[PDB]
Design a protein around this ligand. Structure first.
Ligand code: NAP
Ligand code: CL
Ligand code: CL
Ligand code: NA
Length: 313
């Protein structure tokens, strides 16, 4: 019996990425979608199936919902993940899981007490391309890793740290490992709205492998990462949001020789939704997921707290 999913909040990311995955995935059944406006729920249910539900509490009260997807704004995650878990539902929450480390630990504690899965939906982690890149690095294609950069920036349309910078920060954790420490950062705040619109952070491992992370929403739409090694460099584009049908190309340059490798296309959105569902169905809730989300939340806090904040103009 497929896991019965309800969605709280008719989000952009839900419409574009998560719902088409849920709809297609044999293991998950979209049973209810809730909105602040019934009319919006209904538009979304006409597209993806399910019962349209007015307001979020009524969806949490349903007996045909086993798990809830939470694509709400970052600042509203904690209240609603808390209540979904307390209603006895497993929870697929969009990144960033919540807004700080202490809050993220309380959430996991609530889920833990009840045997429930709480998963942070970094769907990019479920694309095979990063492990293929990591294998090439481990084989020595560019020698020892010296430094890392990653960027995710988009055009003007949480703030740019919580909504966008979490992606390059999470990529640095994936490739550089669990001992990353904050070194310095800048956050640019628009005086007008009081909102972070861009920034750049420097982190380091204890061996001095550095990560420079750029993010923003006042930019052209870029999403890439690059490694500098002792005998070369490796970079790739479309590293956070590759289409399901898109074939990654790994670029390497070393002295007098460059190479590009085309890798298979994969649907990371479907893969993430499927991992979530397999964990719920099997009861095997990987400890690495939650520890990684906690380490993530800490570096994000360390960035917010440590950054030089610059208000313009
Ligand atoms: N769109 C993306 O690709 C993208 C990119 C990076 C990060 N994210 C993350 O995904 C989550 C959702 O982002 P999103 O970009 O998809 O945002 P979005 O389109 O604004 O969707 C958020 C949804 O939450 C609901 N909501 C409840 N209270 C709200 C309020 N006071 N103001 C605005 N919306 C409210 C709305 O649903 P109802 O009106 O139906 O209740 C809205 O559709 C965030 O955690 C964000 O960091 C998304
Ligand atoms: Cl993602
Ligand atoms: Cl390319
Ligand atoms: Na600060």
């Amino acid at each position: 019996n497929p896991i019965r999913v309800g969605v709280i909040g008719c989000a952009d990311i839900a419409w574009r990425r998560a719902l088409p995955a849920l709809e297609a995935e044999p293991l998950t059944e979209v049973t209810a979608i809730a909105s602040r406006r019934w009319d919006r729920a209904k538009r979304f249910t006409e597209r993806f199936g399910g019962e349209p539900v007015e307001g979020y509490p009524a969806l949490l009260e349903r007996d045909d919902v086993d798990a809830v997807y939470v694509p709400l704004p970052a600042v509203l995650h904690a209240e609603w993940i808390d209540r979904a878990l307390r209603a006895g539902k497993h929870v697929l929450a969009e990144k960033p899981l919540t807004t700080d480390r202490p809050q993220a630990e309380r959430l996991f504690a609530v889920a833990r007490e009840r045997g429930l899965l709480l998963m942070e939906n970094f769907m990019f982690l479920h694309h095979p391309q990063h492990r293929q890149v990591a294998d090439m690095l481990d084989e020595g294609v560019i020698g020892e890793i010296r430094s890392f950069a990653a960027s995710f920036t988009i055009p003007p349309k949480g703030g740019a740290l919580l909504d966008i910078g979490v992606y390059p920060i999470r990529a640095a954790g994936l490739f550089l490992g669990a001992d990353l420490e904050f070194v310095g950062a800048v956050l640019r705040h628009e005086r007008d709205r009081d909102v972070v619109v861009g920034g750049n952070a420097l982190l380091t491992t204890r061996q001095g492998v550095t990560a420079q992370l750029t993010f923003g929403m006042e930019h052209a739409y870029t999403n890439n990462y690059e490694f500098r090694g002792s005998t070369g460099r490796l970079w790739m584009n479309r590293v956070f949001t590759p289409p399901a049908t898109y074939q990654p190309v790994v670029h390497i340059e070393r002295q007098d020789h460059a190479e590009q490798f085309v890798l298979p296309a994969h649907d990371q959105f479907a893969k993430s939704i499927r991992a979530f569902a397999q964990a719920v169905l099997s009861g095997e809730h990987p400890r690495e997921w939650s520890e990684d989300s906690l380490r993530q939340a800490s570096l994000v806090d360390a960035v917010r707290t440590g950054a030089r904040d610059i208000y313009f103009p």
